[PDB]
Structure formats: structure tokens, C-alpha cells
Design a protein around this ligand. Sequence first.
Ligand code: CA
Ligand code: CA
Lengths: 329, 329
Amino acid sequence: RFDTEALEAWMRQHVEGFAGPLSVEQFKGQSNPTFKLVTPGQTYVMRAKPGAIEREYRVMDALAGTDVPVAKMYALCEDESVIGRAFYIMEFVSGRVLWDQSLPGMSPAERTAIYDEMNRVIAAMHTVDYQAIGLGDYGKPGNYFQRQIERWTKQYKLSETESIPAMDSLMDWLPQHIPQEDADLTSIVHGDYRLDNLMFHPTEPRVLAVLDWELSTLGHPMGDFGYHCMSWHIAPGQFRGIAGLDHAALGIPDEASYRKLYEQRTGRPITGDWNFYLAFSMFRIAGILQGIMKRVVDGTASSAQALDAGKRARPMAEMGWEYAKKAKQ
Amino acid sequence: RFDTEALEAWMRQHVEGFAGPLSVEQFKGQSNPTFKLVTPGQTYVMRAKPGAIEREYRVMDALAGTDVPVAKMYALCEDESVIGRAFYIMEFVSGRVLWDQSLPGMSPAERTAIYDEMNRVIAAMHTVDYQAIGLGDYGKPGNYFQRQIERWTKQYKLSETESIPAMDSLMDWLPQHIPQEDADLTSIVHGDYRLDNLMFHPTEPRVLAVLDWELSTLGHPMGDFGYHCMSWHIAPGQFRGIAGLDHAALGIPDEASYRKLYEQRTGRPITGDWNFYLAFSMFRIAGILQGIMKRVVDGTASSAQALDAGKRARPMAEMGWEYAKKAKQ
Ligand SMILES: [Ca+2]
Ligand SMILES: [Ca+2]
């Protein structure tokens, strides 16, 4: 509920090519409010807040011109005078957000293409020269895994609602097993890279825009790629994984081939125990899910969706520990 | 707490080669009591009851002389006069009961052998001429899946503790999709065929005895083989599955190869939608696990182990529905 004329005035000076009249609509749902700004010349998307939005804008803006396809940025407004809250203006991209990783409704050749493009974008993101595009201080590089292991160890300990031995074993195992090979390697890391955070062209298997960058920073690629590969280790039905489905029939590549393709795109081979990267990723996911459980156990979020995600903490922790034990020691 | 002299008298007349003195010990745990009968000449195992033990004895006895390795039977006692309860006497077999399906501690070649032998025994069981060994009326053959779908549909409806849409979809989907190809095919079905129900030779990869036959009957092989293949579709950590582990590295065969081997041993190819067989198996398992939840929700079994198994009903039901949707319609 704000002054749309004050915005139209601001947009004339700060949004390239802008020309009213302007009509604001809202989207049903996204942490911070999202609106659809409509003008005859074109449509934009405004991301406001009640009253770290600026990092999304920053990373997405810096990536224009790279191979990581992203929505075009128009303007960021930190001056809460104009509308009563901070916001930014983006392009309104139109396309498909696919949810089910098994890609129902497609031919095998199509599934191959969706997966191949999805691969290409992660390789591209991780090969970007983040310093040349001005993101040099976008996050703290080096010492990624020990920083993260410690963070999530402290977080679980704060939210622990029950004794989960596999979690405890993880918290003790991980810190003593951080690969030494490529420990300093850093790149832009999306944070939550997966199929449903991609906007595909309405009919072609090509991503028009990588979405939800609010968790992104500078970090180790395998923290990002490892989380992305979870799909091959989680089974279908709540957490829409693809473990045990007949991938060769469906046209979905095997994880061995997917990693190999990523290695060739990025030019460097994945050194370091793959089971550690997986074990870490499962640990992290367990930590996040325990956060939800702790809030559900003392009623901050009672949602059916919420306690569903909370009950999944233990099995994630348990699965993490199993992969840990398959790793070098 | 019984008369061991009355048993020694009975054993002289009913147990081939018996000769005391006799010393009875008990085993820690097995539904119906189990004892270790010790004599200088040899050791036996006695399976009593408080006060369908006879089917185990019957099937295990009939299988002697076949390729399904089993403990040797000595005598069945239904005359509750002798000891105050019905019982039977078996050979005391000594060997390994392996629990973890990933087979830690082994070389790849060893894992290949454990799996290959495990395959051989199921093929063998399912190729046995049950009528020639006198089990013709051991169960009701034909119409297996519809009989089972109906049984578990009624069972879930009796124990339903919450709304599980994937379960409901299964209960409606399955009955309308029972394969018509090989619908009458029947064989002996173990019921719960898995690694931990096998007693391996202490150092060789060969099964000395298939255990826990209390659920066995006559039925469709894929009800038994499908349950056995669950391992490739369930992930590690609570339900010790092998979904997503690097099978080629570990020396564990891929499910495609495992089924192919079974087909060659049994001489007939698996006709009928594999995803239906899997979907059915997941449905059945969900039903059994909901039984436990219903008892836990109203306190018949409060055990930590019990509510762990009860919480697994939904995900099993949800995973079943996903495989159902990959099947022919
Ligand atoms: Ca999203
Ligand atoms: Ca057992």
C-alpha cells in the first residue's frame, strides 16, 4: 500500500527507457514482497522489503555479459524516502520453472538437454572471473569448508531437539577430513543451485535466468556443486530426488558422467574425496532442516509444510554419516 | 522354565542320532522362544512358543535336498504334553548374518560374490517344484497381487493415523494395473528375503541357511523378488539401502544386471512392468509400517525402534506413488 506516482517519478530518472503510465500489481507468495510493474512500453519486476536485497541486485548485475544467464537489472533504490522501503527493478522474464527433477512429460532427448544446459550454467558460474566483474569483496574467500562446518555445527547445537548420533559423528568427522587438495579454490557460489531456481525458455532447453540469489557469496565450488548433486542420492517423494530411477531409460545422465562434463567445462578436474563433498552437503542440509524442527517443536512455524521438512533432519544426518564412512577413513 | 528330562526322553525316540546328557540354554531376543540344546554328540536349536511354528518346520523340511540351502530338521512336536508347549528341533548352524547391504569391510570381488550367491538362492527358491516336495497346499496360488493389494488396502484403512494422498492414490492405482502377463505364475515365496535373513559360511561367500521362514507361503515370485530389490531404491541410514552409492566401485551389481542374472537362472524373463512390481512392494511395506504407527499412536508399542519404523510409513507410501507414475499409465 504505497504512492505509485512517487515511484513513476523516480523510475523516469533511474530506469533506462522508462515511460508510463504505470500500473502496480503484486505476486502471490517470497521473503521480501514482489510486484509486477506494468507500462505500455514494457513490464518490470520490483523487489521491495517490509521497511540483504542489495546483494541479489549486485551479483545479478555483475553477471550480465557473462555466460550465466540472468535477468537484466535496471535500478537499486536504498533511499527509503521514495516509497517507504528499499527496492530494485528488474526485467520481467517469462518462461518455465520446472520442479520435479525426473522431468515428467518429456522425451529422453529432452531430459538429456535440460540436464546438459543445467550443467553448463553451473560450470559457467564457477569459471566466472568474479574479481574482473567487481565482486572481489562479495564474500570471504579461502577456508570455506572449515568456516561452514563450524557454522552449521554451532547452528545444530543451538537447535538440537533430540539425540542424533549420526549428526554428532558428522560434526566430529568433517572437521578432521577437509580435503587439502584445492582447499583455497574459490568462485561465485549460487548457494541453492537446483532445477526450480532456473527459468527455462518456454519451449527450448536453455535457461533464460538463474533465480533466487539471496544465499550467494564467494566460496568453494564443490559446496555448491555437491549440493546440486544431492538429487542423485535422495529418493523420490518429498525432496523430489532421482535416486534409483532408471536414468538410462529416462535420458537423465548418471552422476559419474555429469561430474565429468562439469570437469571439462570448468577445465579443472574435481580433486578431493567426492564422498566428503557429499557428506558435507548432507550435513549442511541436515543443519538447515534442524533449524526448522527447533522452530516447530516450540511453535514458531506450525505449518504442515514446516513439520514435514523438520522430520527430515534425522534421515539427512543419518545418510550423511553413511557417505562419510565410505570416504577416505 | 520346563522339565528337561521329559524332553531328553522324547528326543531319544524322535531325534535321529540323539544321545545325552542334555543341557538347555536360551537365546537373547524371536517372536517365539528359542533355545540351544547341548549334548556331547552335537548341538541343536529348539523353537518353542508361549503355550504358526509348524509352517516354518514344514517348508524348511521340504526344501532339504533342493538348492535352497536350509537348516536340517530333526523333529516337530505338537503334543503339548511333553513340555507344556509346541516346538521343533533343528540343526545348529554356525556362520555370519550380515546386516549392512553395502557390505563394509570387503573387497569388490567379495561384494560381487555375496550378491551373486544371494541371487542364486532366490532364483533357486523360485524354480523349486513345490508340488513334488509336498507343498502343493502350502498356500493359495493364483490371483496373488489382487489378493495382496486388497489385504493391505484393508489393513492401512484399519490403521490409518493421518491423510497420506500418495497412499490413497496407490490403493486406487494398483488394483487397476495388475500385469496380465504371467499373472498366474506361482512359486514358494520366502516373504522377507534379504541379506540379514541369510546365514553365510564363516569365510566363504556361500549361504549355509535361509532363515526366518514364518511369513513364507505360495505366491508370485515378483512379490518376493520385488521386495528383495527395494535395496536399490532406498537410501542409506535407517533402512540400510544402497540407492546412490557408487556400485561399480564397491563391486555391487547394478539392478539391471541383477534382474538379468535372476532371469537366466530361473529360465524365464521377467514379463510385466517392473515399476508396478516395485510400486506394489513399496505399497506393501508402507502398509506394514503404518501398522506399527497405529500401535505407536495409541501406545501398544512405545519403543524408540518402534516409532522410528512408524515415521517411515509416509515416505514409503510417497516413494511408491512416484514409481507408480513412471509405470505404464
Ligand atoms: Ca525458488
Ligand atoms: Ca532376521
